[PDB]
Write an enzyme that holds these catalytic residues in place. Sequence first.
Site, PDB file in Angstrom:
ATOM      1  CD  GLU A   1      -2.954   0.759  -0.107  1.00  0.00           C
ATOM      2  OE1 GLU A   1      -3.171  -0.430  -0.458  1.00  0.00           O
ATOM      3  OE2 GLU A   1      -3.443   1.746  -0.685  1.00  0.00           O
TER       4      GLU A   1
ATOM      5  CG  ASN B   1      -0.578   5.675  -1.525  1.00  0.00           C
ATOM      6  OD1 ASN B   1      -1.414   6.561  -1.697  1.00  0.00           O
ATOM      7  ND2 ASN B   1      -0.907   4.434  -1.186  1.00  0.00           N
TER       8      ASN B   1
ATOM      9  CG  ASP C   1       9.042   9.147  -2.964  1.00  0.00           C
ATOM     10  OD1 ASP C   1       9.388  10.309  -2.798  1.00  0.00           O
ATOM     11  OD2 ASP C   1       7.917   8.786  -2.774  1.00  0.00           O
TER      12      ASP C   1
ATOM     13  CB  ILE D   1      -2.598  12.004   2.774  1.00  0.00           C
ATOM     14  CG1 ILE D   1      -2.967  12.935   1.606  1.00  0.00           C
ATOM     15  CG2 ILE D   1      -2.020  10.688   2.245  1.00  0.00           C
ATOM     16  CD1 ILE D   1      -1.784  13.493   0.841  1.00  0.00           C
TER      17      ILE D   1
ATOM     18  CB  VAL E   1      -9.256  11.596   5.808  1.00  0.00           C
ATOM     19  CG1 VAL E   1     -10.630  11.585   5.136  1.00  0.00           C
ATOM     20  CG2 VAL E   1      -9.218  12.647   6.910  1.00  0.00           C
TER      21      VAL E   1
ATOM     22  N   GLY F   1      -6.765   0.484  -4.480  1.00  0.00           N
ATOM     23  CA  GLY F   1      -5.987   0.956  -3.339  1.00  0.00           C
ATOM     24  C   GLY F   1      -6.818   1.360  -2.127  1.00  0.00           C
ATOM     25  CB  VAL F   2      -7.007  -0.170   1.230  1.00  0.00           C
ATOM     26  CG1 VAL F   2      -5.745  -0.096   2.091  1.00  0.00           C
ATOM     27  CG2 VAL F   2      -8.256  -0.343   2.083  1.00  0.00           C
ATOM     28  N   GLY F   3      -5.576   2.894   0.646  1.00  0.00           N
ATOM     29  CA  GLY F   3      -5.067   4.163   1.162  1.00  0.00           C
ATOM     30  C   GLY F   3      -4.090   3.967   2.308  1.00  0.00           C
TER      31      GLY F   3
ATOM     32  CB  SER G   1      -5.774   6.684   6.044  1.00  0.00           C
ATOM     33  OG  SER G   1      -6.745   6.009   5.259  1.00  0.00           O
TER      34      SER G   1
HETATM   35  N1  LIG Z   1       7.343   6.921   0.374  1.00  0.00           N
HETATM   36  C1  LIG Z   1       6.271   7.582  -0.062  1.00  0.00           C
HETATM   37  C2  LIG Z   1       4.978   7.562   0.517  1.00  0.00           C
HETATM   38  C3  LIG Z   1       4.227   8.393  -0.298  1.00  0.00           C
HETATM   39  C4  LIG Z   1       2.791   8.717  -0.281  1.00  0.00           C
HETATM   40  C5  LIG Z   1       2.213   9.432  -1.329  1.00  0.00           C
HETATM   41  C6  LIG Z   1       0.860   9.728  -1.318  1.00  0.00           C
HETATM   42  C7  LIG Z   1       0.068   9.324  -0.264  1.00  0.00           C
HETATM   43  C8  LIG Z   1       0.630   8.629   0.786  1.00  0.00           C
HETATM   44  C9  LIG Z   1       1.982   8.322   0.783  1.00  0.00           C
HETATM   45  N2  LIG Z   1       5.067   8.838  -1.257  1.00  0.00           N
HETATM   46  N3  LIG Z   1       6.324   8.345  -1.127  1.00  0.00           N
END
Ligand SMILES: Nc1cc(-c2ccccc2)[nH]n1
Length: 178
Positions: free
Chosen positions: A27, A31, A51, A72, A75, A77-79, A81
């Site tokens: 997850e 993201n 990243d 983010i 609140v 793909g499950v998200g 959160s």
């Molecule tokens: N390592 C990550 C985590 C995230 C990310 C991006 C959008 C929403 C939650 C997390 N970007 N790079």
Amino acid sequence: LDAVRKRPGMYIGDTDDGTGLHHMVFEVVDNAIDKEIIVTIHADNSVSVQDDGRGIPTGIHPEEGVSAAEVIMTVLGVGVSVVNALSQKLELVIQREGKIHRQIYEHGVPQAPLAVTGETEKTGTMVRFWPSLETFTNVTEFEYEILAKRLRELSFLNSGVSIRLRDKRDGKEDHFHY
Ligand SMILES: Nc1cc(-c2ccccc2)[nH]n1
Ligand SMILES: Nc1nc2ccccc2[nH]1
């Protein structure tokens, strides 16, 4: 997040056979994939995903009245959160617009507002999470090869992204790039 906490298996997958546990990592990586991502399995059995992207937005969300990053994280793909809700601890580091920002959560609850902690010339987002041992039973330790299999599949689909996997418990490493 109480809906997630109430039925974790329904959001993350099976919490007793290692399925849900590893889906926590996938997850976060999903993201991140929206140019180099580094997934590290730490000796304390946490995982971090870093990243070198733009950094998630840090400004105040005009409706929720907290940082957009906190929205983010808290609140539904499950998200991510969901990951946050089921982590006994989660550390967020955002490098954006010349500033390093940090925030800590426990069981999805922010310990303080997202805060500027320094200056930087880099950009990117780092999430490190410790899955809750109150939720994940039986299989509680990450299995390198389960992560490597998925990250390999992802590397083929996302041709412009470099993915590194590192295990600090035994020095194993891989580099997926297509
Ligand atoms: N390592 C990550 C985590 C995230 C990310 C991006 C959008 C929403 C939650 C997390 N970007 N790079
Ligand atoms: N240990 C523990 N588990 C929790 C679940 C939700 C909120 C706070 C918590 N502290």
